[PDB]
Design a protein around this ligand. Sequence first.
Ligand SMILES: Nc1ncnc2c1ncn2[C@@H]1O[C@H](COP(=O)(O)OP(=O)(O)OP(=O)(O)O)[C@@H](O)[C@H]1O
Ligand SMILES: Nc1ncnc2c1ncn2[C@@H]1O[C@H](COP(=O)(O)OP(=O)(O)O)[C@@H](O)[C@H]1O
Ligand SMILES: Nc1ncnc2c1ncn2[C@@H]1O[C@H](COP(=O)(O)OP(=O)(O)O)[C@@H](O)[C@H]1O
Ligand SMILES: [Mg+2]
Lengths: 96, 48, 1056
Amino acid sequence: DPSQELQELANAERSGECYHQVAMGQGQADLAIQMLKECARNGDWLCLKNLHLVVSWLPVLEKELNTLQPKDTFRLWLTAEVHPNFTPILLQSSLK
Amino acid sequence: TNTGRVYRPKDCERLVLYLKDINLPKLDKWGTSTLVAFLQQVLTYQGF
Amino acid sequence: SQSRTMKLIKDWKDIVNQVGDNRCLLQSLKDSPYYKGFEDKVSIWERKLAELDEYLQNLNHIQRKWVYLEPIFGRGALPKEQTRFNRVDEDFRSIMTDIKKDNRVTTLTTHAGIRNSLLTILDQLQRCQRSLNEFLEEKRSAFPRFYFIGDDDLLEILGQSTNPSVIQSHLKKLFAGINSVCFDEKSKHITAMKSLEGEVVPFKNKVPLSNNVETWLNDLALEMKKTLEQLLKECVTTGRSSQGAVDPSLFPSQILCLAEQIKFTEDVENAIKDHSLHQIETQLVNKLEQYTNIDTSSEDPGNTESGILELKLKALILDIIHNIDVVKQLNQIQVHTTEDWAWKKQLRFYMKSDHTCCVQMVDSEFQYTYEYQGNASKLVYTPLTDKCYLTLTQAMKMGLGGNPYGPAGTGKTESVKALGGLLGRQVLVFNCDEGIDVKSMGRIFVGLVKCGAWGCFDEFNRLEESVLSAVSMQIQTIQDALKNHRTVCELLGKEVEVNSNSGIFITMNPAGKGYGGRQKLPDNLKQLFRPVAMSHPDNELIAEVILYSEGFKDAKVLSRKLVAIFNLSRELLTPQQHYDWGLRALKTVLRGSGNLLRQLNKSGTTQNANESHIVVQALRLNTMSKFTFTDCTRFDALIKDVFPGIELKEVEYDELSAALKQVFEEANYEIIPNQIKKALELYEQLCQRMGVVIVGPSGAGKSTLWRMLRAALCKTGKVVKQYTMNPKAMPRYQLLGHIDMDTREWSDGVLTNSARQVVREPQDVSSWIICDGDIDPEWIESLNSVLDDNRLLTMPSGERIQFGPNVNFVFETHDLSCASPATISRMGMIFLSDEETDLNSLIKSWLRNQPAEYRNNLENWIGDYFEKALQWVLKQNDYVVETSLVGTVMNGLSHLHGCRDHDEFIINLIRGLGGNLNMKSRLEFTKEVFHWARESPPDFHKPMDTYYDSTRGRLATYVLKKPEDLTADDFSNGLTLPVIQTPDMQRGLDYFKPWLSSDTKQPFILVGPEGCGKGMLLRYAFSQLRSTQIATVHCSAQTTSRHLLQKLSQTCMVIS
Ligand SMILES: Nc1ncnc2c1ncn2[C@@H]1O[C@H](COP(=O)(O)OP(=O)(O)OP(=O)(O)O)[C@@H](O)[C@H]1O
Ligand SMILES: Nc1ncnc2c1ncn2[C@@H]1O[C@H](COP(=O)(O)OP(=O)(O)O)[C@@H](O)[C@H]1O
Ligand SMILES: Nc1ncnc2c1ncn2[C@@H]1O[C@H](COP(=O)(O)OP(=O)(O)O)[C@@H](O)[C@H]1O
Ligand SMILES: [Mg+2]
């Protein structure tokens, strides 16, 4: 479980509760994109989780990663599981 | 029914045909409209 | 409310039952042979009653909904609603004025077209309901408990703010403890409350009824909590005096048990501070001996008038045995002081200086929240509950949930409710199925965090997988709001007020080798809970404490006997699929013994050998149903080995068997003693538990059992009202109900409707919802909360429908290869075999249905030819489509009735049997049949083609019929090709001709290799008919119900 370390890191390095997080499930994707754009503009962080279930969503995610114009101190944190048929393009443009 | 087929108002009791204009239909070249002759037939003989 | 005047209608059932009597009387007249001269008046009365029934069955709906919706639109008038409801008001009061004029009941058949008036009034009421959705959600956000009431009752309670019948009919489903209330002498105040058995507690002050419903429901909640709080103080205040405050009529059991535990706690914490004090152990032993002695003063009278609450004693014995074991272990280890953790391990019930309780384990503490439980079944304190209680209390201290798990049938679900009982909360047991919306789970969570109740989310495993993922964020938000002591949380946009005495738990199994279709939970979501192992319970401790509590004295021997019977019977007897020896079968047998000792003291006297003699019958009321023949004999041999000379005693009752043999005599079956035994057995099981499986092969008499026990019971017993589902034909969302996804509108289902129809009926009924269809876990596990120790059916909206002590579910089935053992351990069972069936006992009734012109020859030929030819076919077993025994019998029989002579009967037997074989065996089937007949035909080469004629008595010549009508005009249609009558087509037609005639209405199926001549020959036999109407439908891999339904409904009348 990485979530507690991320929470403690967000409490340490930042203050005022800038940390925002959204899990991926039935009916959360279209607000996930809105929160992605809004926290890209604000410069605050964003933690998506469980990107191994929504496998036919990730082309929209990589399109929005290629398109957006972020600010400084923005940090996008992902969390996925080992899964065949994954998409290479965001695997290219990420640490692992 | 017996004695020939007939028409009856659905779901009511007294259907009212409200004819808007009677002077306005067309004579032939003698002076007898077929409309008023038809309604004369209905109001006298209750059929057609 | 507004001072109008109106005449209304009552006593509907008196009118409707006469109509039902008249329609079934017309059906009784339809069986008379002289009906052909009087059919025309029967048509009149048929159509007359068919109209009158629908008119009444609409007008009662309209009356109830109008009575509901008058006061709401009367009080808070919004004119866009008002114009609608005024037009409906006019259209109803205009009808009721004409009914006030003439009150003869057949005037509604002869009014001025009332049918569309009634349907339009119903439709406009449906539409004003859809307008009222928003106001319903406003009042649900107003008062917190309303999220589990449906809309249908909520607008009743909003409207009928003074009606006492409404309050006693629907206040039960709101507060689970109160079963009914009283009223004062003017029906302006509520003064007392009841229970299920009739435990009555007065309230400390009267409750003013009013119109604004929350402004006296809040008064009920506060005044109930204050009443229990002052009653606890009064009881403990008298009890901490030196004399005993023993007066169990004056207090409910909820305060007796709590006062005894608090005083026990303070006395033992004085003790271990002062001295080891075996005096207190001796005091508890003598006090328990006193209670067991006083228990014999109410057991001999038993059923008296205005005297109950022997149960308050039996709910006290168990806590005293708990205290006995605690003091005995403290003696065995010789604890020094209080801070030693072997004392603070044990559960402590302190008193606070504000006089309210504070349940405190090791360091975590909670508060008693004064929910009135009434009488309920508590549990035996096995040492597994130590594990469970400590894990859940530490998990609540850390601000997390709790996830007990393990194999099927242990006690994890009831353990949570037991903790909620010992703590003082209220528990709202759910079920989680079908993949409901995350907003639908969100509103449930909003209700739980606003009320303060423990969601015991039973079966959290089987839920749709991404719903779990969004639910994880929801639970994490709530647990953060708890741990940081937040008053205002926020999910689904709004600022929902979260309660401090809240709590969430789940229960689940691991998705093992046979637990059906369940999806694995996410890792993140597992990190929110705290898992508890609940694998093995005990069996000696529970069985001895229960029997010692239930008045029986010799528990320490017989409990070990029971447990050894369970272990040996599970251990050495042959492992069939459908057996069980869980905790549920034990808990059944213990109540089966408690009931027999409850009878045999108030109905007689008590002695020695009968007390160990009872448990054999109280065990064989369950265990006899499962077995075969030989396994039942070996089980009897095992019962002899554990109990030496206490072997047997049979069925006590016979007067129902007279009626059963009467009803078999009526319906022209036969009378077989085995069917009688199985039917009496079924009545025993249906009295015993909630659900019965009837395992059996095809056609082997497993539906006639309940079908005849219906009438045999109904001739004396009250009412057996049958509802018949078939759960696989219709889709799921129609069966169990579902929600419109965009509108948030609960569509009803089939058996939700049937459940409402049965809980409408009064107390003198009985009903058998029957699911005559195959078994899949993903729907049958949706009824675990119904088939529970609890009795409750839940909607996914949160609406929860209870059940009384009446209803049974009967599940006719084929096999249980695909059912998880939660259901198999959950419900009763009846087994059938292929050895118990009697073939001759079905040949005889078919012979009795013969018109007495051939029966001599037919019986003389059946009795010496049938059994050989049946057993030889069962020896070969090369048959192409798999049937049971009954199927092979009926295939043999249905090509016979109307034989003349012996040589014709041989060929009818061959065409009956050998149709299901293949050509490697049909030839020697014919060889052995003709050889072990009289003679051989001249069809010695290819004997499949013997043409017996009635005209000459010819046996066999195969002749070719050549047509001579041949042009190119025949071939014009691609179909309707000229069939060349070859001998094989003649054999096919000689097969078809007995079954498509107008005397034998038989369904049948041809088998052929692909492209062989099936459709052409069957269309030829369609063309040979007289007044038919063929409608061919090509099925394929997508063909469903609606396709055949519309292919029927294009060419078929609809007559009512
Ligand atoms: N007492 C009896 N004497 C003779 N025949 C009987 C008797 N009772 C039942 N039968 C016959 O047994 C046949 C099958 O009965 P039943 O429908 O109970 O079997 P089933 O296994 O329930 O059928 P299915 O396989 O469709 O579930 C019926 O056709 C009936 O005629
Ligand atoms: N400690 C106990 N004392 C008495 N009865 C128990 C106890 N534990 C379980 N039972 C009985 O076992 C049955 C099933 O318990 P439940 O919690 O439903 O287990 P599961 O959920 O695994 O079926 C219930 O009827 C309950 O009364
Ligand atoms: N006895 C026969 N005489 C002439 N033609 C035949 C005979 N039996 C079969 N056929 C031919 O075989 C075809 C059988 O089609 P059929 O088996 O009904 O199709 P399907 O298998 O799709 O139902 C017919 O169209 C017919 O032309
Ligand atoms: Mg049947």
